[PDB]
Every structure is written in C-alpha cells, then in structure tokens.
Amino acid sequence: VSFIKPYRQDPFVGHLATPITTSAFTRAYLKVLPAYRPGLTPLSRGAEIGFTHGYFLIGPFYTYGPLRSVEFSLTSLAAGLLAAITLLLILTVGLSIYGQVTYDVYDNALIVKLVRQMVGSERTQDLPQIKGTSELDTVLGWQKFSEGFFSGGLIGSIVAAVGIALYSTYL
Amino acid sequence: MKDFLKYLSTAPVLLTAWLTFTAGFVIEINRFYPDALTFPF
Amino acid sequence: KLKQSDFPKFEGSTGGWLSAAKNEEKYVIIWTSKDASLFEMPTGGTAKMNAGNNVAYFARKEQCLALGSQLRGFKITNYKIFRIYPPLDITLLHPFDGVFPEKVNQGRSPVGKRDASIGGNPNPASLKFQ
Amino acid sequence: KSTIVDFNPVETSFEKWAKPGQFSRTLAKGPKTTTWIWNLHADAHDFDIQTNSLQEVSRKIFSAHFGQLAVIFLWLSGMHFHGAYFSNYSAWLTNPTSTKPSAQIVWPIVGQEVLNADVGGNFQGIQITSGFFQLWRAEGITSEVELYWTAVGGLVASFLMLFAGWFHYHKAAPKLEWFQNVESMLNHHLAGLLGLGSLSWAGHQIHIALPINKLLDLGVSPEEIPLPYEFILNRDLIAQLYPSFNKGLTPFFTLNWGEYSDFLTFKGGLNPVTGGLWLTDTAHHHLAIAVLFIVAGHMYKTNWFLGHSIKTILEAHKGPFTGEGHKGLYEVLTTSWHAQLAINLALFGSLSIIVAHHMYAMPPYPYIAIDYPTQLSLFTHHVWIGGFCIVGGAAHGAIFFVRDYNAANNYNNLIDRVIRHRDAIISHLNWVCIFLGCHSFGLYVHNDTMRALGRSQDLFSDNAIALKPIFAQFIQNLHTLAPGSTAPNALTTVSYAFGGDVISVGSKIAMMPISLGTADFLVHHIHAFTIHVTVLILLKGVLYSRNSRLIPDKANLGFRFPCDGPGRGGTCQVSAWDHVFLGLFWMYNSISIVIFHFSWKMQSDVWGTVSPTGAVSHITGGNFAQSSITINGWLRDFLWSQAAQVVQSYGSSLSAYGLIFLGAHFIWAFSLMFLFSGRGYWQELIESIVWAHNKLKVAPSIQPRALSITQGRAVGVAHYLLGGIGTTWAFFLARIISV
Amino acid sequence: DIGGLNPCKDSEVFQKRLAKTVKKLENRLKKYEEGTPPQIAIQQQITQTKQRFTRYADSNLLCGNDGLPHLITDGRWSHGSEFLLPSILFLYISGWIGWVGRKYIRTVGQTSNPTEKEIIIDVPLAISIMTSGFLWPFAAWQEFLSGDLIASDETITTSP
Amino acid sequence: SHTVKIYDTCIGCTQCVRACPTDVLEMVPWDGCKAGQIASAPRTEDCVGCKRCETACPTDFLSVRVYLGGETTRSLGLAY
Amino acid sequence: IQKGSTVRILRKESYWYNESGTVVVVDQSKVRYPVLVRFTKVNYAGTNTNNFGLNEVEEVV
C-alpha cells in the first residue's frame, strides 16, 4: 500500500494527498471549524471566530502584560481586557481594508454561472474570473464577517475575563 | 632533467624561490645590522 | 489512478502549478513517445512516459520548454507547447509555424531588427521627454 | 595481469609537470587571460571533469588520499621533533601543574624574541595549546629520545605513504571492481582498522602506559622509571603495580576475566592525582571497542557464502509512506564519489563536534583539565573543524545531485520522493527557523530592552520570568544517580559535569557540576536556531540544485555558476554553490556563538581555583548567570571585558596575539570588498590600469581580468572566515593564557 | 630645533626609556639560572637594546616630548639619512624591478607564444634582462628620447 | 515586458535562438550575411531577461541586445 | 585590403578599437560586414575574431 498519492488524480498540481491533507480526521476536523462548517452565515462564522480568538487572546495579555500580578488584581484584568479588545479592533480594521480591496461582489455562486452562460465581454475581474464561490468571497459577506469577528471578539474577551476572575477568586 | 628544469621555470616555483631568496637576504641584513632606523651613512 | 490516460506516470510533486494556473494561464506540452522512457520532471522528480500520446501541464512556458529540451535527448522532436487561458483558450506557442525557431522558415518577418550596429544608437540626451 | 590492479598504467615522467593545466581539456590550450590561472587551481582536484572514466577518478582519489596521509604523517613527525628538540617536555614532566607546555622557540630577529615567553622549567618559547605534552604523558613517553624516535618513524611513514601513492597511480593501480567492494572495504575498515587499532592501543596502554603513568602518579621521577621495553621482558615490574599479571594470560583463556579487574576497571570520574580519566578505564574501553568493532566487521558478504549484501538490506526497507524505499541507494553510493564524500564529511564533522564535547566533559589526559588554554583550544578547534566538514558534506551532496544523480535509476525511491516534496520540507524548515530565531533572539532583545528601561523584574532571568531547562536537568540528575542504580558496576558518574564533587588538581578546578539555568536555556535555543538556519540554507541548496520554479533547468548550468541573469527580477546566487557559500557564513555564525558560550560558561561557572577550606572562586565570578541574558551583557561582560588581555598584550610575550587580532580584523574587513562589490566595476577599473600599462608599453600578454563572480564570492567568504576565526583565535588564546 | 624637537642625545625621556627597558630585561634575567641559554639570550637582548639606543643617540636624530626619534622629511640634507637617502635607494631598486619587468614583457611579446613565456619564464632571458637593470635610469632616458618608451594612438579607448 | 533588439551585425549563427529558455527568438530569412538568416524577437512578451541570448552571441559587441523594462508575471518568472 | 593584410579597427564599440588585426578573408558578396579580422587578444567573451565593414577597418602601411 501507498499512503501518498497525487491530489485528486492530478500529478501536476503543487499538492499531494498525504495522510494529513486528505485524511478523514482532517476532513471532519476542518468541516467542524467555523470557517468551513456548513449551515453558517458569514456573520455567524465571524462571530464564532471572534469569540474564540478574543477568548484565547485575553490570556497572554493578562498573564504576561506590563501590569501583571502573581495574585489576582482587577487592574491587571482590566489591562489585559483592554489590550485584547484593542488588538481585536486592529484585526477588524485589517479585515475591513482587506475585504474592501479584495472583492467586488454582492452575491456569489451566480455571477460565475451568468458569465459562463450569458458571456462576459466587459472589463472582467468582476463579471468574469471571481476566485472562490463561498459567501465569504463577497463585499457584503466579508463585511458581515468582519462585523461578526469584532462583536464576537468583544463578547469572548469579556467572557474570558469573567471566567479568569471567577477562577482566581473562588479557587 | 629537461622538463624538470622547465617545471622549475614555471611562475609559482620561480616566484617562491625569488621571494624566499629576497626574504632571506632582507632577514640576514637585519640580523647583521639590526635596528637600522636611518641610512647608515 | 490518474485523471487522463495520456498523463505521464508521475506520482505528483509539490512543485507543480498553483492557484495562478487556474485564473491567469496554464501551459500544456504534448508529445508522442515510442518508449515508456523515464524522464525528470521540470518541477519535481522522475516520471515515466507513455508509449504513445503524452500530455503534461505546467505553470510556466519555461518549464514546458525545459521539458521539451530534455525530450530532444530521447530523440523526441514532435513535442508541442500550448498556452491555456483561464477558460479553454488554447494557443499553440512553441512550434509556431511548425518549424523550430532555430531553423529558418519562409514566411517569417524580422521583428526588432535595427539596420545599424550598437554604435548607431541615439544619444539619451536627445531622447528626453518623449 | 592481476584481476584487481592494472600494471604500469601511467608513466613516471616530468613532461606533464612543465605543461600546466594538462588535466583539463579547456585549460590545456594555455592561458590567454588571468582567469586561466585561477581556473587552473579551481579545477586541480575536480577529477570528475578531467576524465570520463570512474576508474581513473577512483585511482586519482586513492593516490590523493595517500598524499594527504603522507602530509599528515609529516606534520605529526614535525610535532614530535619539536617536542624532542625545541620543547621543555622533560621539565614539564617533573612539574605538570606549574610549568606551561612550550614546544616552539622563536629566533632572535627584528626584536621578535619577546615571543619567547616564561613558560617555566628554565625554558623560553611559545606556550603550546595543542595538548601534546599531556598526550605524550598519557602514552608513557618520559624522555625526549622517544619523541625523536617517534618523529623519525613519522618521517619514514610519510615517505612510505608517498611511495604508496606513486606506486598505486603509476605502477599498480587498482581496478574499479576493487574500489566498488564496499562490503569488503567496510569489513576491513571495521575489523582491521578500527578494531585492531583499538586492540593494539589497548595492548600498548596495558603494557606501557598503565605502568609508566601509575609510577609517574606515585611520584617516581621519569629518570628512575624503567624503560618501556622492560615492562614486557620483566613480568615483575608490572605485577607490582597491578598484581594480576602474575597469573599471565591463563585467566583470559579460561574465561576468568574477573582476575583482570586490577587494570581493566570501570570507575568513571577522574583520577584525583592528574585530573584525567583513569587509564585503566581507558584501556578497558579500548579493549571493549576493539572486540565490538572486530565483531561488527564480520557483517557484510565479501568472498564466501556468509554475511550480508548491502543491496539486499536496502532494497527490503520499503514502506507505505516511502514507496520503493532504499532501492537504488546502493547503486548511488557505489557509483558516485560525491555521495560518499557528502555522507562521510557530514558524519565526520558531527563526530569532530562530539569529540570536542566529550574532551572537556571527561578530560582523557593527565594534567589536561587544569591546562585551560589547552582545553579551550582543543574544543574550539574541533568544533570549527566539525562545522567546516559538515558544510563540506552538504556541498558534496549538492554536487552529487547536480552531476552524478540519475533520474531514471532513482524512480520513486527515497531521493526521488524527497525532491518531489522539497517545497514542504523547505517551507516548514523556514517556519521553524523563523520561530526559533524570533523566540531565542527576541527573548535576548526583550531582556536587553527591559534592562535598558529599568524594568529588572520583566526580564527572562532567574530572578524574573524564568525558563528552567527542566529536561536537561532531569538528564543531569539521571546521570549522577547512574552509579549503583542503572550502572551498578560504576563507582562514579561518567562526568562531574552532570553533578557530584568539585575535582581540583593543585588548587585548580579540573571538572565541576555545570549548572543549567535560564541563561543556558536561551543560549541552547540560540544554538538550535543557528543550526536550523544553516541546515535550511544547505538543504535548500541540495534540493533545489537540479531545478526550481525559477530555473527549470538549473542542472544544465552545473553545480558552480554565478546566476542565470538579471531576469526573473534577478537570479543571483541560485546555484548550489552559492548555498554552500551562504551556509559557510551561517556555520561561522553558529560555531562562533557555540565557542563563545563554551568560553564564557566555563570561565564563569566551571574553571577557577579552590581554596583550602573548599571555597570555589571562578575566573570571572559567575557573571554568566545574570549577564549572558542580554546582548549588552555579551558585548560588555564578555567581549569588552575579556578582550582586555588582547589589547594590553603589546610589549609582553603575548604581543603576537594582539598583532594577529589586528591582522584578522584587517582581513575580515578586507573580505567585505569582495563580498559587497561586483565584477563590472573592477573590470572597468582594470581597463584604465591596462590603458596606463599600454601607454607605457608594459601591458602583459596574459590579459588581466577581474576575478569571476564565483571566485569573487569564494575570495570574500574565505577572507571573512579567516578574519573572523583568526580574531576569535587570538582573543581566546591571549585571554586564556593570561588568566 | 626643527619643529620644536631636541636631539635625542640630550633628551632625558629617551634615557628614561632606555633605563626602563634595561631594568625590565634585567628583572626578567633574574628569574633564570647561571649561564643557561635563556640568560645568554636575555643578555644579548640587553646588549642589543643598549647598542640601538646609543646608535640612535649619536645619529643626528631629533626626539619629541615622548623620547622617540622623529623623522625630519621636509627635504633638508642635514637629516638626509632619514628619508632622502632611503628614498634614492628605493627609487633605484624599484626602477630596476620595473625596468626588468617591462623589458621582459616587451622581449617575449615579440615571440610566437607570448602568453606561454609569462607562466613559464625563460630563465636564461630573464637572468639576462634582470642583471641589465643597473642602468635603468640611463636606459629610461635613452628610450624616452627615441620615442620607444610611450605609445601614441594604438592604445585602446572606450566608447565615449 | 523586456525589449529585445537585433542588429545587422548578426551573422546568423543561431546560437541565440537555441539558448533562449522561453522561445522568444527565432531565425528569419535575410540577405545581409553569408548564412542568409537573421535573428528575430517576435515573442518578447515571453522574454524573461535572463540574457542567455547575448551570452551566446559571438559578434564583437553583440547583435542581440536585451533592455530590461516593465515587469510582468511572465517576465518575472513567477510560477505562482 | 586582402587576406593577410593588417588593418586598424575603427569601430568604437569594439574590444579591438584602435588596435591592429590580421584580415582572414574579405567577402566579395553583398554582405554588410565582409572583412573578417583575427586578433591576438581575446575579447571579454573569449573570441579573437570578428566581421567588420569596409569603412570600419583602416589598412596599416
């Protein structure tokens, strides 16, 4: 037996079907992640990603910041929370500008078919081309994704701060 | 000893011999008349 | 095992084409071989020819031409290279008039020929603001 | 008409000596430009391009090996002759702890006689840091006459190797089938060379070194010690020191090997008198090594129906993840000298570094642990040799890939599958290098900026955020507990570096537990990062030596070429040679950091003096733990502080070290002219110089041309390495000899 | 005197330097035994140091405030043995070297294989030319007069 | 894309055409030299600027000249 | 000029400009650069010969 084969029977792609790229564990694990989980609107994907990211982002800032405390301090928790929230704001700014400069679409998975059927004799790159058919690959989709990331980041950072305070106080 | 003498006539061997001789007479002048800062005359 | 029966018996390498040769352009080289000779891919390692029609896809014209130059060592001459745009827009590239560029063929006009040597080039100061 | 050799293949003539460049097809026509001169030396040993036959290349390589061994024998003979005639070895024998080893006196010219230092023992000369005195003492050499006879034997051996090379190139050259008997070669090199050398050295130790050194440690002066041959003819001179020779060889042949525990011990630790390893332990070690290697030599099938075939072993090691596995590797390693050179050089450099570590870790010679200059010099030299040899192994792997690699013969084997996913390897190695560098160095920079900002509690220090190397401390604990628990027949740990007591000889520390703290964590991760980046450069050179996305036909340009052109945005240094050039730079960086870590850590936390009441005072005073965690600390408390002896050496016997310090700085800066500039400027300047020469009718017929791009890079890297290594050499030697 | 310097024969700091060097050498000499070669070498060092200092003192050498001989190279013949005479000696030797090199280049430049005779020197012709360089000042001002020293327009020039 | 010019010093030795890695140069009929052929550059859009063409030129100061200009994914040799 | 004649190169963009070479052959056809000149000094590319026009070579007396 051989556990490495050309990806999708194409020996010319710059890719391989290894026990890591195309394993059933990899398939299921990546399909349960918010970025690829089926049945999620882009706002929901952004909200979940932001929640998880703020939740694990408050950690390093609170623990190793400039205002640490070997005991529990409200000032240390506030400093870590503010740093995490501002980092989420910076990431949201990056997401917003990236989406602004990347896509020009409001409804995908159709425009591609329209220009593959009804011809696309225009300036292209909006009618024709169009990389990716996901709802995240639109101006509207990425805007809602960034909004969800930002709101979920705030909520997750607050939740993680509350959990840290409870763990440090009642344990 | 016709090609050996031609080998000794090559640039590296001749340069090594000439520089060895040159360093030799310089070192021996500086041994027999050491610490010469100015012209002896 | 492979998508097409005419593909060389290559096991796939992480040196093939990327997302560029799906939305900008891809290059395909075709050739017919008498023997299933073992040759080295321009991208990765060793592949096996088919005793017949062989078709390979690459991301650059230079990769296809390097493969073709390797094919000449196998006494293979009928190799032809095409450019494919994002849709099936096939354009024959290398044997442009059916004759290799090194051999003179009638019907070719000189492109980029100057009727003087290098010393006849105009002075740059006279080529300012044009 | 032998079946292994060809008789009189090449005539012994001086005709080709007078025709420079006769070996090369291109250089044979004669020089037309000065590039021919440089090409003559760059292709001298490239036997692959001089002949199209593997047999001729193999014969040339065999004779070149003989010439190299003759050179090595001449060097050893010179060392022994200097020990015999221009050394204070006899005086050092009677006072090893107070006399500095010197074996080179300097002639009194141009005032250079100041270099003859006060090494002690009514002697003037240059202090020797190669440890030959300790090695000779461990050999039982107690007189300078023995050194003279060893030098004479070395001269005879060097002549013998020269004659062997001449004989095997011109009178009886072996055939290709003889060279390709890798099974027979491995059997012989493992049994005969290694095992029988270990056995012969064990015999010498047992019969000469064991009694003579035991008498020396007992206080017997070298003059009243019996001559070494008397320990063999008289079974009573050795049976008094080791009362087990009275039974003869009967315990050996009767399997009663327990009787020989008198001189075949397993003690560990160090000799309290000399500070080195117990020579009984050394003899037992060499005996065991001899038996193991002799046994290992009976593995491969050579001429009988017995043993292994390396082809059958390799071809059976396939797997689901590796396709054809090792099929074809036997053909690769029996038809390509470059692949063998790659493997041998890489493992040889790694072995040299391992030797360097085990040397200071467990000092194997009497009175060598307390000779700090010798220990520092031996470690640094062996680590440098190891790094150079590893870079050479990578270079020759790349050369094999460019030249001797056959795609057809390596279908779906390990080599093919590695090339097929070279991107993944190189990208992940890139990520690892960035991660390691970011972390190690940025922790250093974070410490530096926290200290500069007056925030001492925010550092990555022991009294701050602490990164304890718990894994290494666990191993240290395991070794110090090994005697009696896991090595029940050991009396002491292998090395006191893992833990134990402070071993001092003559109030000077020989070995002591090397504590590992947060400072060692950072420097060890720096070592890992530098090693990973060097591996990245060399592996990128080897894997992308044949083709790439930039140049799909890079193998057609050869191993050594400057570029493919200014196109593709610029294709400088895409060769594989230009990767052995950058890898040489990074190896210099890594080895420099390694030797700096060794020097500072040893001086600060191992070496020093022990007071009569047991108080340990080190050379620097333990500043490594708290001041080696910032770059400013390395600059000030190590470089600036320990460079005091080099800069203040003028007028003293160490002034040569200051002169070499300055000259190495000059050479290192000189290298940057070749490294930073380009060929076109120098060619156009040579144009005007040639105009002046033509104006004065003195233009040479051999047209002067600027050094080629590849040669410019080679000159730059050679000068850079020479300058940096010489600067560190002078700094280390002056510092460790002064204090 | 010249430039505010004073003769080294009357420079106190010069004698202090000599005394300190001799004292250091004697202190080094004290730690060896009898007529052993180390003591002989150190005594030779002391003797050479004294001889060098005495010769520098009686050499029309000007010493500064540091007690070291300063060279007066403005051109005056009074201190002519410091720069001017060595300058003449070097000019003679270097002109000899350059002249013999140029003569060899021009001589083997008119043979069938000029480039071969540059890596493999014609030692007979080389020896013939080298011992003829003692007249290089005269040979140079006999070839410049005849126009054989300088090329005129066969020399190559770049495009601009 | 880079600019490639051919000059009438061309001797039609074809070494430039058979050295081009991207099939930019070709040999076309001519009457200015013994070989009756001159190099042409009709596919400069594929020119990468490697200058292998003028490394194989035997004429004194070249008959094919490559002038680097605007960059393109083809001229930059980008497989991605 | 003819075979074996000595000429001076007048082409400015030449490695042998202002230098003297030996004419190998002067082509009698209608080529643009008929004069073939061989030189003793190789150029930067290693070649020692080149084709020159009739107005780019000047015969030495």
Ligand code: CLA
């Ligand atoms: C027990 C037998 C034996 C021994 C001891 C050796 C020992 C050695 N071989 Mg060797 N070899 C052997 C059998 C043996 N071989 C066989 C059977 C083959 C055929 C497959 C080869 C093929 C072979 C090649 C192709 C090469 C070696 C090389 C070497 C040297 C490696 C360098 C080294 O480690 O330095 C250690 C050095 C020493 C310890 C110095 C003393 C060694 C002396 C010279 C004894 C050599 C033993 C010799 C075989 C006896 C033959 C004498 C003759 C009259 C018949 C080393 C001297 C390499 C080398 O350096 O070439 C010269 C090399 O390139 N060998």
Ligand code: CLA
């Ligand atoms: C067992 C060791 C070994 C052996 C047998 C070889 C053998 C070979 N190597 Mg190699 N190499 C080695 C180690 C080795 N190397 C190491 C350790 C490195 C890493 C630096 C390299 C890096 C390397 C490169 C990058 C290249 C080779 C090449 C070659 C081939 C031609 C060599 C040649 O003609 O050089 C002839 C010898 C010289 C030109 C000598 C040059 C002088 C050196 C550079 C300076 C030494 C200075 C010295 C230390 C003294 C300085 C002191 C100062 C005060 C004066 C040949 C097969 C070349 C090739 O084409 O392979 C096919 C090539 O491109 N090697």
Ligand code: CLA
């Ligand atoms: C001090 C000079 C210096 C520095 C910092 C580096 C740094 C590096 N070299 Mg190197 N290099 C140098 C000199 C240096 N080199 C020289 C002289 C040569 C000539 C031979 C080379 C040749 C060379 C090669 C051939 C290769 C490298 C590689 C690398 C990288 C290894 C990965 C890594 O650690 O990245 C992490 C970055 C650092 C450790 C730099 C400091 C970063 C700080 C500490 C943390 C981040 C700071 C933060 C972002 C600042 C933000 C604020 C700012 C915006 C204001 C790294 C960028 C390899 C590579 O490409 O990477 C894999 C590689 O293949 N180098």
Ligand code: CLA
């Ligand atoms: C021996 C013949 C010779 C002669 C007559 C000259 C003459 C001249 N050179 Mg020159 N040069 C020579 C050899 C020679 N060079 C060599 C071998 C090199 C290579 C290192 C150079 C490199 C060189 C440069 C880089 C420059 C000159 C310049 C000059 C001019 C000014 C003088 C000067 O700066 O000296 C320069 C001298 C040196 C740098 C050292 C030369 C090295 C040795 C001493 C000469 C070789 C001796 C030779 C082996 C003797 C063999 C003859 C024998 C077989 C009979 C002058 C026209 C300069 C110029 O153009 O100014 C107008 C200038 O910039 N030359």
Ligand SMILES: CC1=C(C/C=C(\C)CCC[C@H](C)CCC[C@H](C)CCCC(C)C)C(=O)c2ccccc2C1=O
């Ligand atoms: C200076 C320089 C040159 C010109 C250098 C030349 C022509 C070397 C000249 C070497 C002379 C002719 C011989 C060596 C003379 C030394 C005194 C000998 C070495 C010293 C010994 C002790 C080893 C280049 O050709 C070059 C090429 C590419 C990048 C950078 C550069 C570069 O920087």
Ligand code: SF4
């Ligand atoms: S010359 Fe220097 S820059 Fe120009 S191509 Fe060759 S390497 Fe790249």
Ligand code: SF4
């Ligand atoms: S650069 Fe020179 S070689 Fe590369 S393509 Fe354009 S012309 Fe052909």
Ligand code: SF4
């Ligand atoms: S390079 Fe110059 S000579 Fe060679 S073919 Fe192209 S044009 Fe003719």
